[PDB]
């Protein structure tokens, strides 16, 4: 505690999304996504840990600040590690006060 907003790890953040993508991914997603998902997502596994952005007041249906949330994609990749093919993405918020976690399911 140094400092007043602080971030998250790359494998803390990656972590904790990958554990709300095994969960989550469900009913809120697509049946031929889920299914897909469950057959190819090992040695496609997908899941960049992105930065926030402009461009969120579209998708989600609300403005985002951007520097300021932990932008997860999980996705399918290939065997040369991409990631032009994601299934859902999750914005959480950095700071440790407020816990906002939001997911997309296909858009």
Do not use: C
């Not at 997603?29 to 496609?44: M, S, T």
């Not at 949330?69 to 590690?81: I, P």
Request: avoid cysteine; proline fraction near 3%; aromatic fraction near 12%.
């Amino acid at each position: 505690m140094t400092t007043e907003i602080k971030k998250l790890d790359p494998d803390t953040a990656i972590d904790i999304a990958y554990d709300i993508f095994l969960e989550m991914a469900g009913e809120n997603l697509d049946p031929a996504d889920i299914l897909l998902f469950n057959l190819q997502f090992e040695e496609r596994g997908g899941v960049e840990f992105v930065e926030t952005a402009d461009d969120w007041e579209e998708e989600i249906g609300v403005l985002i600040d951007p520097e300021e949330y932990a932008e997860v994609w999980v996705g399918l990749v290939n065997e040369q590690d991409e990631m032009d093919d994601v299934f859902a993405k999750f914005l959480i918020s950095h700071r440790e006060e407020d816990r906002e976690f939001h997911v997309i399911w296909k858009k």
